[model samples]
Target: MKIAFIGEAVSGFGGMETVISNVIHTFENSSPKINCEMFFFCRNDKMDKAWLKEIKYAQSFSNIKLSFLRRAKHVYNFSQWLKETSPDIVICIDVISCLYANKARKKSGKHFTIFSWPHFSLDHKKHAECITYADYHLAISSGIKEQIMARGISAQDISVVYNPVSIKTVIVPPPERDKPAVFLYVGRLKFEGQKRVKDLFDGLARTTGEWQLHIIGDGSDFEKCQAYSRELGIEQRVIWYGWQSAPWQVVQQKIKNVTALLLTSAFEGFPMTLLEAMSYGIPCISSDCMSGPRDMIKPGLNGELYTPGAIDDFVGHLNRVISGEVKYQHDIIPGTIERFYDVLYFKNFNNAIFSKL
Candidate 1:
């Protein structure tokens, strides 16, 4: 079957790119009768020096052919590309590019399937388009699915599919707090995290400055956040890990010594980093923030969750975890995170979308 997946940072590298890549591989390795052709899409075909020079090459399947579609600034180019690919199934992972996918489906005339997964809550403001245009819609979490349906997508059309990590029986990372503890925040520096940016640094600023905080992923707010960290007098504690495209390797290597993942964001769709953190059994401390993190962390279970935009609450949560007030006892609550992994995620994903597709 001609299966085309359009999304970006497609040409670049990110959780979106990696998830899409992994799904492509999963599909390839899982099915023998299916002959697949994979197409990767990006806003611009032109290679930017700013984008990753090397994308970690995943194992290749002979049945899958990689195609890159260069698109112009708006949905029109994507619409044009869609007509050319003429795929039986058009699966779009990036919601920002959904506009293009929306347009293409309306004009395509064929009864081809359209599938989309929401990575951010706000991204699916047009739930009808996602629900009606696509044969199926997948949500990265129950929180994400609920939000999309709340935004007007038909609940019947939406099925919950958390990140693939959700089903894995979680590993319990040993508490090795001997090292100077590191506080980690991952994801693009701006846009997705714009509202909560200053709050994060400012909350830390009010602290006694014991823990080291690291920022990963790049965005327009990089310099601004760096300056804010310096202004907070925690400059030395702030480690700029820059943008990590191959996050699995980075996390396995760097997160070994860290106590927990720290995220203070106003919102998120899935916030794969939270799931990623738990994949290593590393406890996380994140703001109950808006849509996503609160749903993922399960206050005091897999991680800690502070109230949204509450600086004091945020600080209190951070201090408790940093000082080890809420130390994780994995044996205390077993299999809570596994429900999210292959146990349910891949099963739901296959039953909800892939099998039907």
Candidate 2:
């Protein structure tokens, strides 16, 4: 089967691109040999080429300037491309793109299934109503599936195909019993907005045990986050490694014994950081955000999830870990997320799509 993935332009390096790459790779390696191609609509001619290096059949449409005219041209050009390619399935990576794909499909006079695979929550995004343009939906998390349902889509029409994470052969060990608990926060460092690094700091501040926080990311709020740490009087216990090109490599080399990963995001798409941490046998402590933590965090098992902005509940979980009252088997943590492993993920992915067909 020929499958076409349509998406908006990405920032050269983002989790959406990585997920698309992995999906393409999986399709290429499958036994029945499903052909997959990616089509992106860009705002300008200058796109980061390095991001598309490993992609096999990928193309981008440039000169998409202005508002209404840009969208009109996107539909016209995509319809022309659809006529040429005649793919059996068109997967819209973004909800807005589903409307474009539907218009293009009608314009091309093609009879193909359109699938909406929204990576983020539909609550905060514009044009979320456009998601109904697709015939089927692929939700990255259960919370996302419910979000789709809230938009009046049927549960049967939406499949909860969670994001994939590779199982690690080498499990990262936890901190030694005698040492201070080592906590990790790896992602964009936003002080108060979406990532809410401020909440992370507030929760940690209220805890009454010896612990160290290692933040391995950089963003617009980097300095603000650092300043907030100082205001909270936790700067000495915090280590900022500024963004690393390969954050996991740094984790494998330097911060080896991680007690747990921490995330205080107000919202997220799939929150791959939590999955990546669990893949390495490291537990996580995340706020029960809109659409991700509930799917991954199996309270008291893999990790703990506290209500968002509840500093006391967050601190309670942290203090338990710090005081050695709550302990998790580092080796067993990886197995908790076995279903998210790529092998099972693709298996379920194929089944979800094929059954719909």
Candidate 3:
């Protein structure tokens, strides 16, 4: 079988790129049971070194094929490429990409299954249009699947799949007072209403602890967040690393020794940060954000969950973990996220993608 993927090949690292890498690796390793050839139609007109490096890395790791095109030109010629490629399956990473795939199917009069794997919640207006075009809709969480069904999508047409996180043999140490607590916030500094990073700094001001906050991403709101940290009197306590091109492996090593991973987002589809942190035996303290937080965290169990917009609750939980008042350990978390590892993700995702065929 030949499968074609459509997505923006941005310069930096992100959730979408990670998912794409995992898919390529999964198929590369699978035996005759799922023999397949993969092709990626990526848009990166800038020819960014980082983006090209990722493409080359994937290609070197596997026999995957790639076609790099300009952003605007890709959209204009997407249908023609699809008709020419005639892949057995077309997987689109977003709503806009799905529209392009469906347009090609219609224009070329081709018969091939199209899968729309949206990385965001289905509540948005753009998602509404693309949902109907998909033979199957892959959601990040079960609640997201429920929301799509309420919006007129058939229940059977959706599959709830979590992002992949690999389990490693890295050592996990106990929380000890010999060192200062290190807190990490690993996401874009986009300052969009969703991330709520400023709120994270504000909550940190309310708590008393010997800890440092390490931010591991950059975005439009990066400078704004830095300014706010100073205004909140936590500037010296925060260490900004900007953005790491390949973050997961670096994050895996970083979290193995940190006190906890923190998420102050107002919303998410399903947080790969939380899963990655947990996969390394590092507990996460997350807000009860829409569609994702409640799915991963069990209050006072593996990790803590605070109500969104409740600064006091966020501070309270941070103090608990910092002061060692909460007795949560590393042993429990890795098991919780093991189900989402690449092996099972591919096992189930492969079955879902080809079951109808």
Candidate 4:
């Protein structure tokens, strides 16, 4: 059957893109029972048509069909696209499109079973509408499930699906130092995007040159965070890599030299980058963040977690991981990785979609 997958920004390299792509690609290489075609829907004005059409192996992979909707309208045009394709099912990757999908179904009452995995907590207006419009309510963690239920979706409607992380051989290892001592905070730096972006520099600065902080994403707050680091007196120690798009293998390899992966974010639906770090046996430290942290880092188990917005807790946890006073290897993490459909991350997602259909 034809299953359409929608993300507001699926093509670029981000968590949503990575998660949805992992699911789609995993099914292609890993599943035996499912026969499906996947399509990508996104705003394409920034995309060059020739290059977009040429998307390296995207068209040929898994024998899938690729399509793009370049029109600049909203639900009206998207609804028209849905009516035109009339696929067996639809799944949106984030809250943005979930809202649009809900509005579309409302306008026509012509609903096709749509599923959108909540990638973040219930921060957007779409939270309520998504619960009402979606056929399946998928959450990243139990916290996410509770959040969805609180937002008015029935618990029965919500399925807590931990994102899959691949444990296969593609795992890459970078050159490890005699003392592998650095920290990584990958993805987005908008302060309004996530208060933790600012908190990250502040949290580390409190400790005074404990370890290098790597910032690996770019957004409106990128410059501000950079300036903040300079003012905090740790600019020399903090490294900023703006908006990188590379293979996951390369990113994982970089993690090898770092003490652990860190996220001072306010929240998440699920965190793919954190899972990727765990696969290499590198520990992860995250702010209790909204949804995924409590599930991944079991507070000194696989890693440590601070209270969602508490700067001291974050600083405390950072120093523990940095000082080697706390251990990175924990018992529950490896098993959690194995059970995750992520070993076949994309393939499992593909098959899971088919199973639901």
Candidate 5:
């Protein structure tokens, strides 16, 4: 069987790329001998010098083949590639790529299974609607699957596949709170109303604790986020790492001493940062956003969740975790995080989609 994936832009390494890399690597080491060839069709728009680290990560998948499809005439170009490759399954990442895949199938006169894997939550209604054409749907959470079903799509057609984490279970020692406890936020700096980063500053102002906020990742909102910090008069307390591609190793050093990880997003398909943090026994504080956080957060167990976009709710949650009022079982977190390993993700995915095929 031939399987193909279509991706766009490599300016910043995000969860989408991380999930794909883990899934492909899982197949590379499959024991039952999965019979399939993997083909990756990528656009070169942002595959510039800054993207070398991400390009290297993709190339490391020795079992997969990569192709640089022209971005100018993406639909027409991909249509031609589809004719040449004729993969048994075509999995698309974004709505644009899904549209291209559908068009390519028609133009190539090819019959293949189409899988739509949108990485956003219900925040993007049009994007979710675009996926209705797919024969199979891959959702990151049960909440997302419900959203698809609300669109009148069948539950049998959709499969809930969480984001895969590569981190091994390692129990971390409790952080010392002699100084201000460090709270880390790892994600893109975008505030498209989805990742309400501005709320972080507002929430911090209301909390009474010796705490430092470290934000890692760069985006269009980089300068805006800097200005917002100063406006809130918490600029000195907040540190910005500004988007590192290979963050797992770099982040390991930072999380070693941090008290907990933080996520202030309005919505998420599946928060990969949360899973990665829990893998090292570090608890997380996140907004009760759509889909992911609710599924993982056990409220004072592995992490705590507050109302979405509520500053006071966020501050309350933050202060409790900092003062050690809200207790978390560090030993249990890493063990629970192991459930998201690639081995389980792939096995469940195969049983959902490829089993019948």
Candidate 6:
């Protein structure tokens, strides 16, 4: 069967782009070879061309601005492409795209199943109501599935196909028993917003331990986070590695001994960083946000989870790990998330789409 994956504009460097590329690759390489194509509605001409290198069938419709008239033009252009391509199914990567796909399908007079595959928490996004335009939903997390149900969609129409992470053969050994704990944070460096790097700093400041934090990311609040570390008198203990194109590679090559990867985000689609870290046999310490951490963290096994925004609870977890009161078997961490590995992820992903068909 032929499939079309539709997405709004992207910077071509985010996790969403990686996930989309992997999904396309999975379909293309499957036995009996499923035909699939990717369509991007761009607001401008800027995009990373290198990201599309391996994508065999991908096209972009640019200058599709957000104005009402421009959006209508985009719909017409997408409709024409739909007629030319004649895909049997279309998967909208964002909720707003579902509305556009529905309109485009009608305009093209084509018969195709539409699937909404929102990559983030619907509670924090706009035009979430448009998700109902699709025939089925592919939830990246159980929290996201509940959000869909809260919008009046039945559970039967949604599938929880969490994001994928390839298993790693080399394990990044944890810090030795006597060495200072080394905590890692690898994502956008937003201080007070969704990432809550401020919370990470505050908890680390309150905890009494010999620890060092290695941050491998960059954002608008990069300077602010550094200044906050100085104000807390912890600048010497925090190492800012800026933004690395391959953060994990930097971790493997540089900061080798990781006690645990830490995430203090207010919410997430599925927190691929946690999964990525766990895949390398590295335990994670994350806030139990609305959607993702619960799905991946198996407290005392893979890692620990605390209530979001609770600085004391966050500090408490950190203190225990630092004092050797809490420990995780790093070698076993990879097996804990075996289901999220690519092989199983694509199996479930294809099953979900085919079941709907």
Q: Please give the lDDT score for candidate 5.
A: 0.71
* Candidate 4 weakest ten by summed lDDT: 54-63
lDDT for each residue of candidate 2 in 1-357, tens digit (9 for 90 to 100): 899988887776777787778888888779678888778887765557676676644454656456778888888888888988899999999988999999998899988999999888989788889999999999998888888898899999988889899878999898886798899999988888889989899988998878999999999999888889889999999999998988899999999899899999898877899999998888899999987888888888878999887878989999988887888777899899877899899888888888899
Residue-level lDDT tens digits of model 4 in 1-357: 455665453435345555555455544455462223333444343423332232221111111233222322456666666665665666766665666666666664565778767676665334344555567766667787777677677776666667766564433332243453577777766765654677877887886334776677788877777788889888888767678775244455554465667787766656777887776565787887676777776667667788777889878787776666776543335555664645544444444455555
Q: Using Cα atoms with residue i matched to residue i, what is each candidate's TM-score against the true structure?
A: 0.70, 0.95, 0.78, 0.69, 0.77, 0.93
Where does model 1 exceed 4 Å of error?
Answer: 1-9, 38-44, 47-89, 94-109, 123-131, 166-181, 187-195, 208-210, 215-223, 239-256, 330-335, 339-344, 354-357
> Model 5 — TM-score against the truth?
0.77
Query: What residue pairs clash in candidate 3, if any at all?
Result: none
The order by descending lDDT is 6, 2, 5, 3, 1, 4
Q: Clashing residue pairs, candidate 6?
A: none
| Candidate 2: C-alpha RMSD after superposition | 1.8
User: For residues 54-92, what per-residue lDDT tens digits would candidate 5 score against the true structure?
Assistant: 222221111123333343255566666767667788777
Each model's lDDT: 0.62, 0.87, 0.71, 0.61, 0.71, 0.88
The 10-residue segment of model 3 with minimum total lDDT is 56-65
**What is the lDDT for 53 in model 4?**
32
User: Quick one: best TM-score, which candidate?
Assistant: 2
The superposed Cα distance between candidate 1 and the true structure at residue 15, in angstroms, equals: 2.4
Ranking by TM-score: 2, 6, 3, 5, 1, 4
- What is candidate 6's CA lDDT for residue 55? 71
* Residue-wise C-alpha lDDT for candidate 3, range 1-357, written one tens digit per residue: 767666444444565766776686567567753333333345323424443333322111111234223423454465566566667787777766676677667777768898877777767435456667667877777766776677688877887765677786653545466577888888888554889887888888888778888889998888888888888888998988888976656655664567788898878866887887777777889988766777777777778888778889999998988888895678777877655887887777877777757
lDDT-wise, the better of 1 and 6 is: 6
lDDT of 3 at 205: 87
Model 1 clash number:
7
